[PDB]
Structure 1
Amino acid sequence: ESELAKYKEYYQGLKSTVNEIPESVASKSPSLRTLHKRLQLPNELTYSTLSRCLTCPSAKLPDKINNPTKGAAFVNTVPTNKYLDNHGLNIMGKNLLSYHVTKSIIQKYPRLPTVVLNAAVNAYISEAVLAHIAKYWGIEVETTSVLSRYLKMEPFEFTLGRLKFFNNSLNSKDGIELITGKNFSETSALAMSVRSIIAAIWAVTEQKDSQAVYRFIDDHIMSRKLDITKMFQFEQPTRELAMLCRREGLEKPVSKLVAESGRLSKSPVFIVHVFSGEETLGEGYGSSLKEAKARAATDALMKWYCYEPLAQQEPVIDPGTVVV
């Protein structure tokens, strides 16, 4: 006999299992099972599907393997099947995230500016955030080599359970990164995995319970804290407020001193209110008068934009951003 032959046949078996993701093997994988139990995924979502979601596309081994001298070696993963990876799933998950999150944000804040809305959406479902979520869930990367695994003589089940992409061995050894594309990044792979899981959930539940996916998203993605007030940065807000007042049936906004203390000091306090008629729109405190005025305008704009109506109200469609 020969040990090379033994290793080779093991590798071949592993490749075959990757191509298939046979259901029994996937079931045997403890990590997959624990992930399934942790997230409370549907029973219709098979363990093979979950394994596939963790399998990123990796058809051909790249040219950068040829030289570890240039700071890269791809020796962990094994080639995947063209029609059994997380790629199609991932796209679907991304689409779902882009639809649902955005919709939820619009429901919450129907006048939110377009740029601000986009930023909020990004915050909710940015690649880094998605990667973090995946890490939290316990989607671990297949860092160990194939040869090493063979030597240990571990089953293929464990491999199936881990996340599988062209992860560069010696990525940041001796403090040297190679700056490769998105197809070799860990964060991206983790993002794909979390999107792929969502897509798989959708696939299994859509006919029985159409909104199951969206309630899962709400539980995991939309449950996260984001203060929308911290997102804004105005420029000349008084002018913008005046424009807004003009657009609506409101009197011209003027700022007026409500209260004042410590004028002729290092740190005064000036309270000014931007009135439109007798109604106050924005209240603004400040060290200077100018500052206070600015703050009142910004407050007014916040109140305009971040207005969140009740669920009992009929839908509020805003009349666009205030084009100054």
Structure 2
Amino acid sequence: LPESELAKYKEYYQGLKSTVNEIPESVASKSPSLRTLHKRLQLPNELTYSTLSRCLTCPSAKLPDKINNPTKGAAFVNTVPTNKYLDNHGLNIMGKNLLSYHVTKSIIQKYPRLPTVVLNAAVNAYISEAVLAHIAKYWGIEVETTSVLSRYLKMEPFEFTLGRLKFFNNSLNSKDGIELITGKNFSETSALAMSVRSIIAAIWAVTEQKDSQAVYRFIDDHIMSRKLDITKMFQFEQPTRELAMLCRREGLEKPVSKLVAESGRLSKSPVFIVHVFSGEETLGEGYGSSLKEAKARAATDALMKWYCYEPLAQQEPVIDPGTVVV
């Protein structure tokens, strides 16, 4: 037996594992994918390539007993056991925290008096898991969907592996339409989200002292730049009552809906225009096919105006008296 192929393969595997444990800097530098990623997002140069690699590495300590059932749906043959002290697990949390803070703050700045539920929804939209995954995909953080054996056969260096995202992905997970339902740890989207968070965390770490706001700026460029129409987030129960309550709370005369213009009464499709007056100051215009509908619309409009108020930067930070409660 001139060639012990099992031995060579084993050696290769060991080497790969070692690299993962280390994430040597030289190896990271050699990786093209990582380099490309770095250039793409215009990351600060203090951020090393090892760090980047780490960010793409999700915590995979011990292979589950779910592997032993490929006959029962799942098989995990792509990943290699990660170092416990060198995963993205810590970074990820930090990133998440940052996202929670900063995005929320931004939203508040944009829209004081935004009903808490609505605010929460907005936040979710900005930084939900799915959205984060999408962002990651866009960036180009690809997943390691190639078995270690396959890689060995190909004869690709470890640099490529480092460049790819690494977690316990179920090879053979959606074949013949069968999907093994597992925890959050084994989903691709979640992994992507984590990676995204980790990148942010890394950035923060590098630029905590030289330029504290850099991270925030980056986030704004990437996360806060995304369009979300806040008007599309609301849904009112009986808004008239709420409006009245609001008026009572503030120094306003009781609101009254009044007919401003009307056309096509006695028809399939009429148009009624009703304003909700508070003395003289019109508080909400509302159109409708019926009178009732129009009234409702007016109320809704008023509520929207009250809530989605967006004050300028030259103003002194406005703080609302919470949400109206009835």
* Shorter-chain TM-score tier: over 0.9
Structure 1 Cα separation of the partners of residues 236 and 145 of structure 2: 46
Alpha-carbon distance in 2 for matches of 1:37, 1:77: 27
Hey, what does 2:249 align to over in structure 1?
247
Alignment equivalent of 1:296, drawn from 285, 295, 298: 298
Structure 1 stretches of 4+ with a deviation exceeding 6 A read none
CA–CA distance in 2 between the matches of 1:257 and 1:276?
Answer: 14
Q: What is the CA–CA distance in structure 2 between the aligned matches of 1:295 and 1:66, rounded to whole Å?
A: 60
Report SS of the residue matched to 1:256. strand
| CA distance in structure 2 between the aligned counterparts of 1:161 and 1:190, rounded to whole angstroms | 14
Paired residue secondary structure (2:285):
strand
Q: How big is each residue's C-alpha offset from its partner over 1:134-188, in whole Å with a ceiling of 9 and x where there is no partner?
A: 0000000000000000000000000000000000000100000010000000000
CA drift of 1:286 comes to 0.1
The one-character-per-residue Cα deviations of 1:11-44 (angstroms, maximum 9, x if unpaired) are 0000000000000000000000000000000100
User: 1:21 aligns to what?
Assistant: 23
Cα-to-partner distance string for 1:240-267 (whole Å, 9 max, x where unaligned)? 0000000000000000000000000000
Q: How far 1:77 moved relative to its partner? A: 0.5
CA RMSD, Structure 1 to Structure 2 (Å)? 0.3
Residues 1:286 and 2:288 aligned together: yes
| Distance in 1 of aligned mates of 2:228 and 2:208 | 29
Structure 1 stretches lacking a partner, 5+ long: none
Q: Name the structure 2 match of 1:69.
A: 71
Alignment partners' CA distance in 2, 1:171 and 1:198 = 30
Partner Cα separation in structure 2 for residue 169 and residue 65 of structure 1: 10
Instruction: Give a deviation string over 1:183-220, Cα, whole Å, max 9, x none.
Output: 00000000000000000000000100000000000000
**Separation in structure 1 between the aligned mates of residue 94 and residue 256 of structure 2, nearest angstrom:** 50
Tell me, in whole angstroms, the C-alpha distance in 1 between the residues paired with 2:253 and 2:85.
Answer: 63
Query: 1:54-102 CA distances to partner (integer Å, 9 max, x unpaired)?
Result: 0000000011111101100000000000000000000000000000000
Confirm or deny that 1:178 pairs with 2:180: yes
| 2: CA distance, partners of 1:11 / 1:292 | 70
Candidates 146, 149, 154, aligned match of 1:147: 149
Q: How many residues are matched?
A: 324
Counterparts of 2:25 and 2:98 in 1: how far apart (Å)? 27
1:226-248 CA-partner distances (Å, limit 9, x unpaired):
00000000010000000000000
- Offset at residue 109 of structure 1 (A): 0.3
CA distance in 2, matches of 1:258, 1:222: 40
- 1: distance between equivalents of 2:192 and 2:317? 36
Q: Offset of 1:306 from its aligned partner? A: 0.1
What do residues 281-320 of structure 1 show as CA deviations (whole Å, max 9, x unaligned)? 0000000000000000000000000000000000100001
Q: Partners of 2:72 and 2:112 in 1: how far apart?
A: 52
* Partners of 2:83 and 2:70 in 1: CA distance: 26
Q: State the distance in 1 between where 2:31 and 2:62 align.
A: 26
Aligned pair 1:165/2:171, yes or no?
A: no
Q: Residue by residue, what CA displacement relative to the aligned partner does 1:100-132 show, whole Å, maximum 9, x if unpaired? A: 000000000000000000000000000000000
State the SS of the aligned residue for 2:315: coil
- Distance in 1 between the 2:38 and 2:273 partners? 56
Mapping of 1:87-126 within 5 angstroms? 87-126=89-128
**Structure 2: distance between partners of 1:179 and 1:234:** 36
Q: Provide structure 2 residue ranges, at least 5 long, that are not aligned to the other structure.
A: none
Matched, 1:319 2:316: no
Three-state SS of the structure 1 residue aligned to 2:286 is: strand
CA distance in 2, matches of 1:279, 1:156: 70
Query: 1:133 deviation in Å?
Result: 0.1
